[PDB]
Amino acid sequence: CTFEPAEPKAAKNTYTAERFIWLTKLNNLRILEQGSERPLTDTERATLMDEPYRKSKLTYAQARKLLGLEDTAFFKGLRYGKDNAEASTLMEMKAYHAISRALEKEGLKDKKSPLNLSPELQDEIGTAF
Amino acid sequence: SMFKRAIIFTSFNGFEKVSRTEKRRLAKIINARVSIIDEYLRAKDTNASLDGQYRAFLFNDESPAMTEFLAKLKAFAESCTGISIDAWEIEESEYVRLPVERRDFLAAANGKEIFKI
Known part of the structure; x- marks a missing residue:
């Protein structure tokens, strides 16, 4: 990671990572x-x-x-x-909406209802995929 | 005799195309309240007037009209999956004191949130 050597660098398609990008843009x-x-x-x-x-x-x-x-x-x-x-x-937010569209398109998510999955779970899905 | 203003901002969220019928429905809802007093904020059915617009309606607290109107708005928002309505509330005491420049935006920030959908 160069910040936490024990942990790896990972996962653009991640609530935490996408939110980092978003906050960097907004703050700048x-x-x-x-x-x-x-x-x-x-x-x-x-x-x-x-x-x-x-x-x-x-x-x-x-x-x-x-x-x-x-x-x-x-x-x-x-x-x-x-x-x-x-x-x-x-x-x-490509990752959030990709997960949301996948669920919306199969009958598990009411469209335009906020995705209730935890930030941890979203990070995990991003890293896994 | 306390005047609450309901600031509602209508946005187009992209998830689905917006049926001309839904635009007519929302225009009817908004235009029911408008009179020659507030001929500004008359609701057309075009995107330009329904998408990305703040409208501040004047209501009188201790009168059951504000609640009915906001309930109708919430019902439409729940129905339409592709239009998002934001409601706030500010007393006219504070509203009139804001600078006209972008008052509705400011009133939205300085006002009690009602429902976001």
Whole structure:
């Protein structure tokens, strides 16, 4: 692991790993409004935190809707010259939704009902598969 | 005589395509409450008006209309598997004091959560 030599490095498709990716993006995501830069307030982060699980993908424009961001407020780390750039993904929990779609498609999960499996169990499924 | 405002934000969650019929249903639900007083937040059936929109309805506490409306909303949300409704609640005392700039968002953060579905 280079952090815990006894333990191995593992499992991108993992609640813990996907959540690491998500939190790294969210914590590093800053919005530039015409003028200067600023990072998301704690209420904004709290608002966005659970949306990658609730929706299929948290689109950048979709994030603008959630925050009532109001054009003249643009995302940094986003090529805004390209047209309809805000259809970019910004985050997709591939593993969580892969497990959820598998269960949904076979009759064990009520679609759009949160996956009740534990983070431990999700990590285990990711590592095993 | 205390005015609670129910802030409801409607999002399109992707899991399924959204039947034109469901858009008409939700538009009927939302537009039942609207009057010339709040001709803003009139609900169309197009995605642009139903997807990713905050609407703050004014209700009067000690009146059973707020609860019935929110129950109808919750029932539709439970039914529609592909539309997600978020409800909050704020007293108008605090609501009016916010800066108009993005009031509904702020009211959502500063307000009592009701149901997320």
